[PDB]
């Protein structure tokens, strides 16, 4: 068959186009898989570092409110100390005047 | 008839050349995209590392400030207790002198 040999070549060319498309799709899939393996460890270390940062930022806010409570507590005690020291001065002054009137 | 056959074999050789150029071009394009993505991930990683360094430094500063405040507060509470006992002693002296006087 002279034309049967020609029809065989046209059949072959259609089959070769199908094979090309399959090989082009397979190369894409293989490259995406290699890519995922390349970024896997880095994506995991990134998510871990974001969560550690979220926890630290949360801890920092708690630390600020603790500092605020401590400063206000300290200011109250420093003022109380001031009014007790002045009470001592007042009492020393009173004691001296009373002591001169007996002695 | 034979020239038409030689034309089909010439065409098939050309289709193979094209498929090969296309296979290479898809790989190069994917590599550019993947390299771009890797650079973005690496950049985000370096900014999370810098944010973590900054947070760890703030955590040290906050915690050390808390530690200093608690120790300062204990010192003042202790000094207050001493002064309060001095007031009690002076009020006792004031009461004994006041009874001898008025």
UniProtKB/Swiss-Prot annotation, chain A:
It is found in: Cytoplasm, Cytoskeleton, Microtubule organizing center, Centrosome; Cytoplasm, Cytoskeleton, Microtubule organizing center, Centrosome, Centriole. Ubiquitinated by the SCF(FBXW5) E3 ubiquitin-protein ligase complex during S phase, leading to its degradation and preventing centriole reduplication. Ubiquitinated by the anaphase promoting complex/cyclosome (APC/C) E3 ubiquitin-protein ligase complex, leading to its degradation and preventing centriole reduplication. The 35 nM long coiled-coil domain mediates homodimerization while the globular N-terminus links the dimers at an angle of 40 degrees to form the inner ring. Nine homodimers form a cartwheel structure with an internal diameter of 23 nm and radial spokes connecting to the microtubule triplets. Forms a complex with CPAP and STIL. Interacts with FBXW5. Interacts with NUP62 and TUBG1 at the centrosome. Interacts with CENATAC; the interaction increases with CENATAC acetylation. Interacts with FZR1; the interaction is regulated by CENATAC and leads to SASS6 proteasomal degradation. It is linked to Microcephaly 14, primary, autosomal recessive: A form of microcephaly, a disease defined as a head circumference more than 3 standard deviations below the age, sex and ethnically matched mean. Brain weight is markedly reduced and the cerebral cortex is disproportionately small. Central scaffolding component of the centrioles ensuring their 9-fold symmetry. Required for centrosome biogenesis and duplication: required both for mother-centriole-dependent centriole duplication and deuterosome-dependent centriole amplification in multiciliated cells. Not required for centriole formation in embryonic stem cells but necessary to maintain centriole architecture. Required for the recruitment of STIL to the procentriole and for STIL-mediated centriole amplification. Overexpression results in excess foci-bearing centriolar markers. This is Spindle assembly abnormal protein 6 homolog. The gene is SASS6. The chain holds residues 211 to 311 of 657 of the full protein.
């Amino acid at each position: 068959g002279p034309s049967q040999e020609l029809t065989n070549e046209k059949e072959k060319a259609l089959q070769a186009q199908v094979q090309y498309q399959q090989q082009h799709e397979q190369q894409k899939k293989d490259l995406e898989i290699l890519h995922q393996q390349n970024i896997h460890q880095l994506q995991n270390r990134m998510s871990e570092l974001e969560a550690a940062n979220k926890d630290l930022t949360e801890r920092k806010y708690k630390g600020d409110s603790t500092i605020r409570e401590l400063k206000a507590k300290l200011s109250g005690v420093e003022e109380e100390l001031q009014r007790t020291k002045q009470e001592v001065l007042s009492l020393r002054r009173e004691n001296s005047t009373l002591d001169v009137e007996c002695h």
